[PDB]
Symmetry: C3
Subunit: 130 residues, 3 copies
């Protein structure tokens, strides 16, 4: 931003060919960090910080990933703490466990379509579906 302090290093001691090597903005700098911290910031928060005990904190407002092929997470465990709005097909290869009422048009169980299934009643006849 305008107002930053630059270090101009003239080449060949001419006051021309002046080249700015570093441009610091002391008004918008992160301060009071841990001994070994390396990151990238912006002039209002927005810190992608890598801290001591293997933590890649990403403090931002609206993160928007933009991939072209795929996105592999490769983590033994991941939580979300919020709503998820997957807009296409899902797939799970493990014992998924829900804790509230689930809703769907029909639940094809083992190939047998629920919402249209008919049992065989006591007196040898198809039981009305429900």
């Amino acid at each position: 931003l305008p107002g930053a302090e630059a270090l101009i290093a003239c080449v060949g001691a001419q006051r021309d060919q002046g080249i700015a090597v570093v441009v610091e903005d002391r008004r918008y700098r992160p301060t009071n960090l841990e001994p070994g911290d390396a990151g990238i910031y912006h002039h209002e928060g927005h810190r992608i910080r890598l801290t001591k005990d293997g933590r890649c904190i990403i403090t931002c407002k609206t993160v928007e990933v933009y991939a072209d092929e795929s996105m592999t997470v490769d983590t033994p465990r991941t939580t979300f703490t919020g709503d998820v709005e997957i807009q296409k097909g899902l797939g799970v290869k493990g014992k998924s466990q829900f804790d509230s009422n689930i809703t769907a048009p029909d639940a094809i169980i083992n190939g047998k379509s629920t919402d249209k299934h008919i049992h065989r009643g006591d007196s040898g006849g198809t039981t009305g579906p429900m």
Copy 2:
């Protein structure tokens, strides 16, 4: 993030447990591969775990 997080990827895998702590939503054919567990499965508006069929001799069957 303070507001929302958009992934915008045609395909994404996870390779591990997921512990979504709030409401889920899928607009496509969500195919599972193991037993699912829920208090009840509201199917097409008909609440499973309380449904009663109409038996052969003109009467309600059982709630199971």
Copy 3:
């Protein structure tokens, strides 16, 4: 990559002890950005950009967390 322009700053004015402080590549640099930006790039797209109104855009091809 080869062909980048470096600023050699000789120490003690000897033409030895030459140290390269900055190595710019003007051929592969992001241009025409908003007033306040800060990111990291690669010589074909791949911008992890921080934009004005709290947007941490991550434009890549196949992002792989580990």
